[PDB]
């Protein structure tokens, strides 16, 4: 019967449920903790957010060097949403 409600997903969760949440132009990994308070813990630490997009650990993507060559970027995570871009 104990639930969390997430207005960003519009869904009701049980204790221990995990889900993805859209917020602040990023995707968060959230967990319904409950604690009698609908408590939710969410994080972006295990995803990368660059150039307005959201990436998972191991994803790579391309972007022009703001020039004028392409960069290849990779999502590392390392507990702080770390990503790196270098010329290819």
């Amino acid at each position: 019967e104990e639930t969390c409600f997430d207005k960003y997903t519009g869904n009701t969760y049980r204790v221990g449920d995990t889900y993805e949440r859209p917020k602040d132009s990023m995707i968060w990994d959230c967990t319904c903790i409950g604690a009698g308070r609908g408590r939710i813990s969410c994080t972006i630490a295990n995803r990368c957010h660059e150039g307005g997009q959201s990436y998972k650990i191991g994803d790579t993507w391309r972007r022009p060097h703001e020039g004028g060559y392409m960069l290849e970027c990779v999502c590392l995570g390392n507990g702080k949403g770390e990503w790196t871009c270098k010329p290819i």
């Binding site: 639930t3 969390c4 409600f5 997430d6 207005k7 968060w28 903790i33 604690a35 308070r37 609908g38 408590r39 939710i40 813990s41 969410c42 994080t43 972006i44 630490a45 990368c48 957010h49 660059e50 060097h65 060559y69 960069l71 390392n78 702080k80 949403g81 770390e82 990503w83 790196t84 871009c85 270098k86 010329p87």
Partner: peptide
Amino acid sequence: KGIVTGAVSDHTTVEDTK
């Protein structure tokens, strides 16, 4: 040539919804 590395601070949140 440039290299760029990004990360996030304040990356983990807790809120109550009930």
